[PDB]
CSV table of C-alpha atoms in Angstrom, one decimal:
chain,number,residue,atom,x,y,z
A,2,UNK,CA,9.2,-13.1,-9.6
A,3,UNK,CA,8.8,-9.4,-8.9
A,4,UNK,CA,9.6,-7.1,-11.8
A,5,UNK,CA,8.6,-3.6,-10.6
A,6,UNK,CA,10.5,-1.1,-8.5
A,7,UNK,CA,8.4,1.7,-7.0
A,8,UNK,CA,10.3,4.7,-5.7
A,9,UNK,CA,8.4,8.0,-5.4
A,10,UNK,CA,9.1,10.9,-3.2
A,11,UNK,CA,7.9,14.5,-3.2
A,12,UNK,CA,11.5,15.4,-2.5
A,13,UNK,CA,11.0,16.3,1.2
A,14,UNK,CA,13.8,15.1,3.4
A,15,UNK,CA,15.8,11.9,2.7
A,16,UNK,CA,14.4,8.7,1.3
A,17,UNK,CA,17.3,6.4,0.8
A,18,UNK,CA,15.7,3.5,-1.1
A,19,UNK,CA,17.9,0.5,-2.1
A,20,UNK,CA,16.7,-1.9,-4.8
A,21,UNK,CA,18.3,-5.1,-3.5
A,22,UNK,CA,18.6,-8.6,-4.8
A,23,UNK,CA,15.5,-10.4,-6.1
A,24,UNK,CA,12.4,-9.3,-4.2
A,25,UNK,CA,14.4,-7.5,-1.5
A,26,UNK,CA,14.6,-3.8,-0.8
A,27,UNK,CA,15.3,-1.4,2.0
A,28,UNK,CA,14.4,2.1,2.9
A,29,UNK,CA,16.1,4.4,5.4
A,30,UNK,CA,14.2,7.7,5.6
A,31,UNK,CA,14.4,10.9,7.6
A,32,UNK,CA,12.3,14.1,8.1
A,33,UNK,CA,10.4,13.4,4.9
A,34,UNK,CA,7.5,14.8,3.0
A,35,UNK,CA,5.4,12.0,1.5
A,36,UNK,CA,6.9,9.0,-0.2
A,37,UNK,CA,6.1,5.4,-1.3
A,38,UNK,CA,8.7,2.8,-2.1
A,39,UNK,CA,8.2,-0.9,-2.8
A,40,UNK,CA,8.7,-4.0,-4.9
A,41,UNK,CA,6.1,-6.0,-6.8
A,42,UNK,CA,4.6,-6.4,-10.2
A,43,UNK,CA,4.3,-4.2,-13.3
A,44,UNK,CA,0.7,-5.3,-13.8
A,45,UNK,CA,-1.5,-5.8,-10.8
A,46,UNK,CA,-3.9,-8.6,-10.6
A,47,UNK,CA,-7.1,-9.1,-8.5
A,48,UNK,CA,-6.1,-12.8,-8.3
A,49,UNK,CA,-2.6,-12.4,-7.0
A,50,UNK,CA,-1.5,-13.6,-3.5
A,51,UNK,CA,1.4,-11.4,-2.4
A,52,UNK,CA,4.1,-12.9,-0.1
A,53,UNK,CA,6.5,-10.8,2.0
A,54,UNK,CA,8.8,-10.9,4.9
A,55,UNK,CA,9.6,-7.6,6.6
A,56,UNK,CA,13.0,-8.3,8.2
A,57,UNK,CA,12.9,-4.8,9.7
A,58,UNK,CA,9.8,-2.6,10.0
A,59,UNK,CA,10.7,0.4,12.2
A,60,UNK,CA,8.8,3.6,11.5
A,61,UNK,CA,9.5,6.7,13.6
A,62,UNK,CA,6.3,8.5,13.3
A,63,UNK,CA,3.8,8.1,10.4
A,64,UNK,CA,4.5,5.3,8.0
A,65,UNK,CA,2.7,2.3,6.6
A,66,UNK,CA,3.8,-1.2,5.6
A,67,UNK,CA,1.2,-1.8,2.9
A,68,UNK,CA,0.2,-3.4,-0.3
A,69,UNK,CA,0.0,-0.5,-2.7
A,70,UNK,CA,-1.2,-0.2,-6.3
A,71,UNK,CA,-3.4,1.5,-8.9
A,72,UNK,CA,-6.0,1.0,-11.5
A,73,UNK,CA,-7.1,3.2,-14.3
A,74,UNK,CA,-10.6,3.4,-15.8
A,75,UNK,CA,-11.3,4.6,-13.2
A,76,UNK,CA,-8.2,6.0,-11.5
A,77,UNK,CA,-8.0,4.4,-8.0
A,78,UNK,CA,-5.2,4.2,-5.5
A,79,UNK,CA,-5.5,1.2,-3.2
A,80,UNK,CA,-3.9,0.0,0.0
A,81,UNK,CA,-3.9,-3.1,2.2
A,82,UNK,CA,-2.2,-1.8,5.3
A,83,UNK,CA,-0.7,-4.5,7.5
A,84,UNK,CA,1.3,-2.3,9.9
A,85,UNK,CA,1.9,1.4,10.7
A,86,UNK,CA,3.8,3.7,13.0
A,87,UNK,CA,2.1,6.4,15.2
A,88,UNK,CA,-1.0,6.7,13.0
A,89,UNK,CA,-3.5,4.0,12.0
A,90,UNK,CA,-5.0,5.2,8.7
A,91,UNK,CA,-8.8,5.5,8.6
A,92,UNK,CA,-11.5,7.1,6.4
A,93,UNK,CA,-15.1,6.6,5.5
A,94,UNK,CA,-15.9,3.2,7.1
A,95,UNK,CA,-17.5,0.6,4.8
A,96,UNK,CA,-17.2,-2.7,6.7
A,97,UNK,CA,-14.7,-5.4,7.6
A,98,UNK,CA,-13.0,-8.4,6.0
A,99,UNK,CA,-11.1,-11.3,7.4
A,100,UNK,CA,-8.0,-12.4,5.5
A,101,UNK,CA,-4.6,-14.1,6.2
A,102,UNK,CA,-5.2,-14.4,9.9
A,103,UNK,CA,-6.2,-10.7,10.3
A,104,UNK,CA,-9.3,-8.6,10.4
A,105,UNK,CA,-9.3,-5.5,8.4
A,106,UNK,CA,-11.5,-2.4,8.4
A,107,UNK,CA,-12.5,-1.1,5.0
A,108,UNK,CA,-12.4,2.6,4.2
A,109,UNK,CA,-12.6,5.0,1.3
A,110,UNK,CA,-11.0,8.5,1.2
A,111,UNK,CA,-10.4,11.2,-1.5
A,112,UNK,CA,-7.5,13.2,-2.8
A,113,UNK,CA,-7.9,16.5,-4.5
A,114,UNK,CA,-5.4,18.0,-6.9
A,115,UNK,CA,-2.8,15.6,-5.6
A,116,UNK,CA,0.1,13.5,-7.1
A,117,UNK,CA,-0.9,10.3,-8.8
A,118,UNK,CA,0.3,8.0,-11.6
A,119,UNK,CA,-1.6,10.3,-14.0
A,120,UNK,CA,0.2,13.5,-12.9
A,121,UNK,CA,0.9,15.9,-10.1
A,122,UNK,CA,-2.6,17.5,-10.1
A,123,UNK,CA,-5.4,14.8,-10.0
A,124,UNK,CA,-8.5,14.0,-8.0
A,125,UNK,CA,-9.3,10.4,-7.1
A,126,UNK,CA,-10.7,8.0,-4.6
A,127,UNK,CA,-8.6,5.7,-2.5
A,128,UNK,CA,-9.6,2.2,-1.3
A,129,UNK,CA,-8.3,0.8,2.0
A,130,UNK,CA,-8.2,-2.3,4.0
A,131,UNK,CA,-6.5,-1.5,7.3
A,132,UNK,CA,-5.6,-4.3,9.7
A,133,UNK,CA,-7.3,-3.8,13.1
A,134,UNK,CA,-4.0,-4.4,14.9
A,135,UNK,CA,-0.4,-4.2,13.6
A,136,UNK,CA,0.5,-7.4,11.9
A,137,UNK,CA,3.5,-9.2,13.4
A,138,UNK,CA,6.6,-8.7,11.2
A,139,UNK,CA,9.8,-10.8,10.7
A,140,UNK,CA,8.1,-14.0,9.5
A,141,UNK,CA,6.5,-14.9,6.2
A,142,UNK,CA,3.2,-13.1,5.6
A,143,UNK,CA,0.6,-13.4,2.9
A,144,UNK,CA,-1.9,-10.9,1.5
A,145,UNK,CA,-4.6,-12.8,-0.4
A,146,UNK,CA,-5.6,-9.8,-2.5
A,147,UNK,CA,-8.7,-11.4,-3.9
A,148,UNK,CA,-10.3,-11.5,-0.5
A,149,UNK,CA,-9.9,-7.7,-0.4
A,150,UNK,CA,-11.0,-7.1,-4.0
A,151,UNK,CA,-14.2,-9.1,-3.3
A,152,UNK,CA,-15.0,-7.5,0.0
A,153,UNK,CA,-14.5,-4.0,-1.6
A,154,UNK,CA,-16.8,-5.0,-4.4
A,155,UNK,CA,-19.5,-6.0,-1.9
A,156,UNK,CA,-19.4,-2.3,-0.7
A,157,UNK,CA,-19.5,-0.8,-4.2
A,158,UNK,CA,-15.8,-0.2,-4.2
A,159,UNK,CA,-15.0,-1.5,-7.7
A,160,UNK,CA,-11.5,-1.3,-9.1
A,161,UNK,CA,-10.7,-0.1,-12.6
A,162,UNK,CA,-10.3,-2.2,-15.7
A,163,UNK,CA,-6.7,-1.1,-16.5
A,164,UNK,CA,-4.2,-2.5,-13.9
A,165,UNK,CA,-1.1,-0.5,-13.1
A,166,UNK,CA,1.6,-1.6,-10.7
A,167,UNK,CA,1.1,-3.5,-7.5
A,168,UNK,CA,3.7,-3.5,-4.8
A,169,UNK,CA,4.4,-4.3,-1.2
A,170,UNK,CA,5.4,-0.9,0.0
A,171,UNK,CA,6.9,1.3,2.7
A,172,UNK,CA,5.0,4.6,2.7
A,173,UNK,CA,5.9,7.6,4.9
A,174,UNK,CA,4.4,11.0,5.7
A,175,UNK,CA,6.5,13.6,7.6
A,176,UNK,CA,8.5,10.9,9.3
A,177,UNK,CA,11.7,8.9,9.7
A,178,UNK,CA,12.5,5.2,9.9
A,179,UNK,CA,13.9,2.1,8.5
A,180,UNK,CA,12.5,-0.9,6.6
A,181,UNK,CA,13.8,-4.0,4.9
A,182,UNK,CA,11.3,-6.1,3.0
A,183,UNK,CA,11.4,-9.1,0.7
A,184,UNK,CA,8.5,-9.6,-1.7
A,185,UNK,CA,7.5,-12.6,-3.8
């Protein structure tokens, strides 16, 4: 019952995103700048369990297969990264959390004068859970987001009171690749 289509690119290279049937989408990208594409929900929830099955996850270089969303009040961009390409994202280490058969490291980072849902020139903190090893793809996976929300809270990483979208995303950074993901 997804109802949100996320498709943002800074315009660099080619990001061929297909909004497929139901919860399904694909991305074929090449020689990109930065981009984020995914399917999910118009209003995020700290109580939502996200299901997905990545039929293809094939980054060539730097890309993430990740829960992705925002809050406002305050403005926070958040990630639950299940898999990646050549680079495992890290930042300021906060702790760990076990969820959905995985162990995730918790990080914070900051963006300065960068694109956000509030405009092209904003400064904000990012919250991360990053799986310690790449999650197997091709079978049904779950992200029990509450586990992350609560772990983040325990480290003083509180989300905002105004929930924006919440999607299961393919994100890329100066890379190429292909993905095909179904979200529900």
